[PDB]
Amino acid sequence: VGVSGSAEGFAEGVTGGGDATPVYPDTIDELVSYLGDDEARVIVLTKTFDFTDSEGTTTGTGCAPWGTASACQVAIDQDDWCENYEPDAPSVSVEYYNAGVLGITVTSNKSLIGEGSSGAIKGKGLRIVSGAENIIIQNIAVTDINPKYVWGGDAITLDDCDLVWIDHVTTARIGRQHYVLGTSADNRVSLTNNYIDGVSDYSATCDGYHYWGIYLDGDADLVTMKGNYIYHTSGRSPKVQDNTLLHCVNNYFYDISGHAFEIGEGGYVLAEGNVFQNVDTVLETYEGAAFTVPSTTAGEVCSTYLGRDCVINGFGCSGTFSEDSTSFLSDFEGKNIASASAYTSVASRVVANAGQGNL
């Protein structure tokens, strides 16, 4: 048992803990120790490690900027957020678990893989920060992190790192972001075959659709998103900006009541071979640059930089998405480009291979 397959895209070459002898944590204490260790580790999760109440509960005053209905989620007044973002929002009492607020620190040369459909962390997410590099997280589930509270916790956090490969991971019922990319450079990252479950009891849109999906706000990021299953979200799917070059290929965006893409200044996106099914608005904000392969002929321009043609996207009951900025394509020269299949096989392939347990 060990890491199955290999990273495709920008993070091609990750080895994680390498061939170090696998360790099997019995307690949450052991898991935390191994992840923040100094040695190259290959940690195998054979069960659910529940952190929910491991750090107690905090009672305080937050705010409800999205309504006071029970289907809506509220915000913990972190960093005076309510005061300088929603000064008009009604104050509300909040009670949340401390464990979710901050994730488990992951250090360099680590390989965290789950076994079958058993490996899972509940109530606390992961946090790859402080320059950690060469990390592989595969076949695990990170769920239930203060669902009702924005600022109650993020599932996967990458802030100042390099060579990170997250594959076959399932995230669900998270208070805020499922994936947050730094603020500092995260460099080479490959998100593949992940299942983002947006079905939640509390949502910022008060309708059961998770709004805080993926947030790419890295300072110098090269992110590859392939074979991912983005499901039931209402926004930030994904939100790209800062200085991020996103290669969005062969992903399945399904049932998005709201919007998917939010491209800001400094965000560059190459969307090819994706399938958008029941996505009301595919592109909301567009201040950066994107090439969505408007047609097959248009896909031929990729040849010079990617070494091959780009593949068109498929649309079913979805809004349009057609942008053709090619100026940034030169940035792909000398990088590891993930291959692309036709969109006709994406839907079927993703739902069968995306997420934990489908490895």
From Swiss-Prot:
<dbReference type="GO" id="GO:0005576">
    <property type="term" value="C:extracellular region"/>
</dbReference>
<keyword id="KW-0624">Polysaccharide degradation</keyword>
<keyword id="KW-0961">Cell wall biogenesis/degradation</keyword>
<keyword id="KW-1015">Disulfide bond</keyword>
<comment type="similarity">
    <text>Belongs to the polysaccharide lyase 1 family.</text>
</comment>
<dbReference type="GO" id="GO:0047490">
    <property type="term" value="F:pectin lyase activity"/>
</dbReference>
<feature type="glycosylation site" description="N-linked (GlcNAc...) asparagine">
    <location>
        <position position="109"/>
    </location>
</feature>
<dbReference type="InterPro" id="IPR045032">
    <property type="entry name" value="PEL"/>
</dbReference>
<keyword id="KW-0732">Signal</keyword>
<dbReference type="InterPro" id="IPR002022">
    <property type="entry name" value="Pec_lyase"/>
</dbReference>
<protein>
    <recommendedName>
        <fullName>Pectin lyase A</fullName>
        <ecNumber>4.2.2.10</ecNumber>
    </recommendedName>
</protein>
<dbReference type="Pfam" id="PF00544">
    <property type="entry name" value="Pectate_lyase_4"/>
</dbReference>
<feature type="disulfide bond">
    <location>
        <begin position="63"/>
        <end position="82"/>
    </location>
</feature>
<dbReference type="GO" id="GO:0071555">
    <property type="term" value="P:cell wall organization"/>
</dbReference>
<dbReference type="InterPro" id="IPR011050">
    <property type="entry name" value="Pectin_lyase_fold/virulence"/>
</dbReference>
<feature type="disulfide bond">
    <location>
        <begin position="72"/>
        <end position="206"/>
    </location>
</feature>
<keyword id="KW-0325">Glycoprotein</keyword>
<keyword id="KW-0964">Secreted</keyword>
<dbReference type="GO" id="GO:0000272">
    <property type="term" value="P:polysaccharide catabolic process"/>
</dbReference>
<dbReference type="InterPro" id="IPR012334">
    <property type="entry name" value="Pectin_lyas_fold"/>
</dbReference>
<feature type="disulfide bond">
    <location>
        <begin position="302"/>
        <end position="310"/>
    </location>
</feature>
<comment type="function">
    <text>Pectinolytic enzymes consist of four classes of enzymes: pectin lyase, polygalacturonase, pectin methylesterase and rhamnogalacturonase. Among pectinolytic enzymes, pectin lyase is the most important in depolymerization of pectin, since it cleaves internal glycosidic bonds of highly methylated pectins.</text>
</comment>
<feature type="active site">
    <location>
        <position position="236"/>
    </location>
</feature>
<feature type="glycosylation site" description="O-linked (Man) threonine">
    <location>
        <position position="68"/>
    </location>
</feature>
<keyword id="KW-0456">Lyase</keyword>
<feature type="glycosylation site" description="O-linked (Man) serine; in strain 4M-147">
    <location>
        <position position="348"/>
    </location>
</feature>
<keyword id="KW-0119">Carbohydrate metabolism</keyword>
<dbReference type="GO" id="GO:0030570">
    <property type="term" value="F:pectate lyase activity"/>
</dbReference>
